Amino acid sequence: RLHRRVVITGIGLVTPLGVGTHLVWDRLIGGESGIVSLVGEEYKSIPCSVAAYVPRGSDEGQFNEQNFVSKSDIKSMSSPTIMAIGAAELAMKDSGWHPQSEADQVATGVAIGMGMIPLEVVSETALNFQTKGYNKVSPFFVPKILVNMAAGQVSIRYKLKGPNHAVSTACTTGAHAVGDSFRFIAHGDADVMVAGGTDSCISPLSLAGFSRARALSTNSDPKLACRPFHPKRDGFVMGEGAAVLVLEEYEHAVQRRARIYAEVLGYGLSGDAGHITAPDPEGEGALRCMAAALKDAGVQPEEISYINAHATSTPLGDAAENKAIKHLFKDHAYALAVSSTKGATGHLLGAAGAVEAAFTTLACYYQKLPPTLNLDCSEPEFDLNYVPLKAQEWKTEKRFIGLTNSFGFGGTNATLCIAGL
């Protein structure tokens, strides 16, 4: 009917690498990581000893809550909410879109989700209730647990009256936010979508839960703990962060004289259906969502040159994705490059797919491929180019097209197809 192209005009990053689009990118290409050792008595007795935290402060690349939100706000709202607000402020500023018009406002929606409720706030309110009773319980408790509070807050501040779609899917949230936003724009429900994910669930209880699930890396050393594709990978490293992306219809962007990073071509979604804990050993579900994304994009596998892998430094997971890439791309798999950025940021949970979407986008804009960290050596099953250790220039005779993969609990798979102009 009407074919609307969708592009990215704005990036907002609040990450374990720091804050700001240039800064976080420069650091990621440089081979930096945010993974650090846990400190304090609370954490003792917990099998994981490492996590990845957004640096807080006034210094450049440090997240300062006070710049983004008011004193009253800080007390009222959860840490994931505040990060999303900040990421969103930065993205809109990056976009230079500030809708003043009613027409512009109705044209602009939000799609920002949160993977997990912060367990600490539950526990603190629950104890307060038992100890001190109902009168004591704060009214803001329920808003603190709600997923869409982030989206609501951004919506009010930037006056965004278009489609609102907060989505929590745990590990895949950010991927669904971008993909669903793309679909909405492409359908004509909006000209502009503010999209992303946030997570800030690093806590004794949360880490306990994940450790007991056998998800987490047991390694004491923050430098080595997260090692995607590596032989010694023992589990993922929990991270915290938000990423926000402004998606826009192409002509809308072009005409307002916006800076365009990249074009969203394709979204794909699939289910494994084998098992809740365990990835499909052959990666048949990952294959299917990648291929669904390509079909959406109108692109053949041979056209893809980079993949931002969802590898999270787990034995079964990293293997599955690798099989699927090999089967999908056949001989061209040895032509492409695959990297996992999880060594730098940790697993950002809800935010993971948004930040990796932002990274894939930037890869397209700069023709530069972020490293897989800690990949010193590689087993024969892992024979592809994983951009080990050092960043690589992205070279191809055709157009720059990449995939970013987000796989989640229960066998939910998501893939985005992002291209250079």
């Binding site: 004193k71 009253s72 009168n135 004591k136 704060s138 009214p139 803001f140 808003p143």
Partner: protein, 82 residues
């Protein structure tokens, strides 16, 4: 003598002036939290909790719903006295 009303009014104001969301110059005894101070329901619940600590008595939610102004709070506090 248990209490003086003007004194419970200074206390109510004192609590309100301590709440961050209220703006001091705008604060008036007859100012309505939602209508003039821009506060929301959730903000008002917090105000009553502050009043609860200050005067050392629990206020049931039904009665708290009713109190939409400082003067109104004062009158409920005074109910214990003449």
């Amino acid at each position: 003598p248990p209490l003086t009303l003007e004194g419970i009014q200074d206390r109510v104001l004192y609590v309100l002036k301590l709440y961050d969301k209220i703006d001091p110059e705008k604060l008036s005894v007859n100012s309505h939290f939602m209508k003039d101070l821009g506060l929301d329901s959730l903000d008002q619940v917090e105000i009553i909790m502050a009043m609860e600590d200050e005067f050392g008595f629990e206020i049931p939610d039904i009665d708290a719903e009713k109190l939409m102004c400082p003067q109104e709070i004062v009158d409920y506090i005074a109910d214990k006295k003449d």
